[PDB]
Design a protein around this ligand. Structure first.
Ligand SMILES: O=C(O)c1cc(C2CCCCC2)c(OCC(F)(F)F)nc1C(F)(F)F
Length: 135
């Protein structure tokens, strides 16, 4: 029945963001998309069905959905319209999401901390932290 990844399941709303604009610059997002994407207040809906995890983000800018099995690479179109190759694993209770494209890489870690879901993103040393709470 239950799995350790069940502490991520639910509906989550963004409550704070730090340095996201700079992270998006590093990733290569252009001005207009950065401004509109940075303005978004996404909710994230995380569900599990068997081995398949689904993460949906809903906002006024774009809605995105990925479904995956841990440790099994998939192709993803990101909200900023990159086409990337992604792998997501669980490493000591942290969901680790690596995206690779055009010889570049970025890592997005998701962890439960108290009542929050904390998202830490890094690209070439540029960092962002986004904090979600249950909706
Ligand atoms: O989870 C997040 O809050 C998050 C959210 C977004 C989107 C979701 C839809 C509305 C606009 C922002 C995102 O987009 C990708 C890029 F940032 F590159 F534009 N990246 C991340 C993150 F990097 F942190 F995983």
């Amino acid at each position: 029945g239950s799995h350790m990844c069940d502490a991520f399941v639910g509906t989550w709303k963004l409550v704070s963001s730090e340095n996201f604009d700079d992270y998006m610059k590093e990733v290569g997002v252009g001005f207009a998309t950065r401004k509109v994407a940075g303005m978004a207040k996404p909710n994230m809906i995380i569900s599990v069905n068997g081995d398949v995890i689904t993460i949906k983000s809903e906002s006024t800018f774009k809605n995105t959905e990925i479904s995956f099995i841990l440790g099994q690479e998939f192709d993803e179109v990101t909200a900023d319209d990159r086409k990337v190759k992604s792998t997501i694993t669980l490493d000591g209770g942290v969901l680790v999401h690596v995206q690779k494209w055009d010889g570049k890489s970025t890592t997005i870690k998701r962890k439960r901390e108290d009542d929050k879901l904390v998202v830490e993103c890094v690209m070439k040393g540029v960092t962002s932290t986004r904090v979600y709470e249950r909706a």
